[PDB]
Structure formats: C-alpha cells, structure tokens
Amino acid sequence: SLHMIDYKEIEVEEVVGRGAFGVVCKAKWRAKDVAIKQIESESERKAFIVELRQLSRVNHPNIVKLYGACLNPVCLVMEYAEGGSLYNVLHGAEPLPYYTAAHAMSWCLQCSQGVAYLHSMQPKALIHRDLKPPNLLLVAGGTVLKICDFGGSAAWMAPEVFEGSNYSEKCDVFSWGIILWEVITRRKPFDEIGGPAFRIMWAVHNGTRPPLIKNLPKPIESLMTRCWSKDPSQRPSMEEIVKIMTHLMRYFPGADEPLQYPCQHSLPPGEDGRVEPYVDFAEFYRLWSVDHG
Numbered sequence: 530s531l532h533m534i535d536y537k538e539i540e541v542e543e544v545v546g547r548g549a550f551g552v553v554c555k556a557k558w559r560a561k562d563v564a565i566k567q568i569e570s571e572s573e574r575k576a577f578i579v580e581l582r583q584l585s586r587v588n589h590p591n592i593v594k595l596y597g598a599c600l601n602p603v604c605l606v607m608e609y610a611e612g613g614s615l616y617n618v619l620h621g622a623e624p625l626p627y628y629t630a631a632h633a634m635s636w637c638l639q640c641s642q643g644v645a646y647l648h649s650m651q652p653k654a655l656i657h658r659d660l661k662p663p664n665l666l667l668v669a670g671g672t673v674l675k676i677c678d679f680g681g682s683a684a685w686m687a688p689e690v691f692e693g694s695n696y697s698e699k700c701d702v703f704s705w706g707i708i709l710w711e712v713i714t715r716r717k718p719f720d721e722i723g724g725p726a727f728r729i730m731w732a733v734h735n736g737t738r739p740p741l742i743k744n745l746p747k748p749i750e751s752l753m754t755r756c757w758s759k760d761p762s763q764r765p766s767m768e769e770i771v772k773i774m775t776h777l778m779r780y781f782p783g784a785d786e787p788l789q790y791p792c793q794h795s796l797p798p799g800e801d802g803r804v805e806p807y808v809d810f811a812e813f814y815r816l817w818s819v820d821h822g
C-alpha cells in the first residue's frame with residue numbers, strides 16, 4: 530500500500546540538502562510541514578524506486594515516516610524533523626541545547642528499538658549499514674528519535690565492513706556502541722586522529738576504540754564495549770540491547786522533557802585514553818542504590 534500524492538498538492542519551499550542522489554526540500558501538504566525528496570536526473574529513477582519500495586515496507590515508531598509519493602514527477606513525501614539531525618543537536622551550530630543522561634540513554638534505546646525492528650524483517654533482515662548521528666532525526670522537542678538513511682562514515686563503521694569481509698546485521702551493533710559513547714561524552718568519535726578517513730580505518734582495524742569514560746556505570750560500560758568487539762559474533766543482538774536498555778531506563782527518569790535550555794561548550798583534550806561524560810550519572814547511582822547498593 531502506497532498513498533498516491535499529486536505534485537500540484539505540494540508547496541515546495543527551500544532546499545534542505547543533497548544525499549547520494551536526489552534533492553531534499555522543505556514543503557507543505559495538507560496544512561502540515563513536510564519533507565519532499567525529488568529526482569534531478571533520469572539516471573536516479575531506479576534508485577528512487579528502490580527507496581520507495583523499502584520506505585513503504587517499513588512501519589515502526591523509530592523509523593522516519595513516509596507519507597506518500599508522487600509519480601509524475603517521482604517524489605517522496607516524508608515527515609519533517611524540525612529538530613534536525615542528532616549530529617546537529619550534539620555537535621551542530623550554536624546555540625546547542627542542554628541534554629541529560631536520560632535523553633542520551635532514551636535516544637540510544639529508541640535507536641536500538643528501530644534497528645531490532647529492521648533486523649526482524651521477514652523474509653530477509655534489513656541491515657542499516659550506515660548507522661551514525663547524521664542519519665538519526667529528532668522530533669517531539671528532541672525526545673523522539675527517527676532512523677533515516679541519507680546515502681564520511683569511518684568513525685561508526687564496523688571493521689569487517691571496511692576490511693571487505695562478508696558482514697552481518699552485527700555491523701549496526703558496532704555502530705550503535707559508538708553512538709552510545711558519542712551521546713554520553715558529546716564528542717565526535719576519533720576526532721583527535723583527523724586527516725583522511727583511511728587513518729580512522731587503520732586505527733579501528735588495529736584495535737583502536739573511543740577512550741574510556743570516567744565514572745561510567747559498569748552495566749553501561751560492559752554493554753558499550755561488547756558492542757564494539759572485533760569478533761562480530763561477540764557483539765549482542767539488537768533484541769538484547771533493547772532488553773538491557775529498557776531495564777536501565779528505570780534509572781533514567783526525565784526522557785520526555787523537551788530540549789529547551791541553551792548550553793555553553795568547552796571540550797578539553799582527554800589524556801591517558803580517558804574522558805569525562807557530558808551527561809551526569811549521579812542520579813543513576815542514587816536510584817540504583819535504592820534498588821541495590
């Protein structure tokens with residue numbers, strides 16, 4: 530089932546961006562703020578059809594909603610994420626918003642719920658392959674995460690993918706582990722390396738991982754490091770990550786609070802492979818202690 534939309538019913542506004550193919554503009558349709566993906570060359574037709582068949586096969590609260598599509602000319606109608614991407618929220622232009630440990634943990638749970646859903650696809654699992662914060666959009670005051678694919682990814686790539694190896698849906702698990710580190714620390718992974726992308730590939734292939742987080746709870750540290758293991762078969766499945774993350778949310782109240790506070794940013798270079806979290810874990814420890822201790 531595909532909701533047919535006539536191009537005359539759409540009021541195309543400003544260009545938002547350009548992915549591997551097509552053009553994404555902001556648009557209006559049925560008294561609502563929408564996103565349109567349109568074709569620029571007759572070459573990208575085959576690629577539009579592939580996108581249209583995959584976007585219309587998927588239905589989950591954490592995967593970008595396709596509203597419908599135009600046929601003449603070919604155009605995709607999507608929900609609009611006013612909050613922009615997660616990368617923009619974390620590392621974008623000033624003023625950047627303040628966020629809590631509950632926000633960081635919720636975003637990652639929602640990402641795992643969306644990926645577990647993709648991995649459960651019948652008759653064949655859907656592997657994202659490009660899980661990273663520029664591919665994650667935020668809605669509902671930055672409280673609700675939506676997985677996208679816009680077509681540099683080195684920092685989040687599992688080493689078996691870039692090594693040429695025949696990989697599995699476990700490459701997404703690796704990518705999720707990196708994003709988890711990223712939302713907790715509010716740092717760009719492997720930013721200190723720099724240079725071209727192959728320098729990141731070289732380090733990660735040689736065993737390099739993001740630095741350890743000071744005062745990071747052991748249940749979270751243990752989950753993070755398993756996700757980024759060299760052996761993909763040692764990484765937990767997304768269903769397990771969903772289960773563990775859902776259980777940990779009990780100690781992370783306040784995820785439904787909108788992002789509305791401005792943050793002032795200072796990033797000191799971490800020494801001895803150890804960094805400070807951006808988020809505060811004092812409340813997690815207090816709430817864990819009431820239950821355990």
Ligand SMILES: CC(C)(C)c1c/c(=N\C(=O)Nc2ccc(Oc3cccnc3)cc2)n(-c2cccc(F)c2)[nH]1
Binds near residue numbers: 545565566593607657
């Ligand atoms: C189901 C998954 C795996 C997450 C997937 C998503 C996807 N495409 C999109 O997400 N496209 C898209 C998403 C959002 C969008 O509009 C925006 C913009 C920025 C802000 N708000 C809305 C315009 C296009 N996919 C895709 C992309 C290219 C080819 C293809 F076959 C599938 N695949």
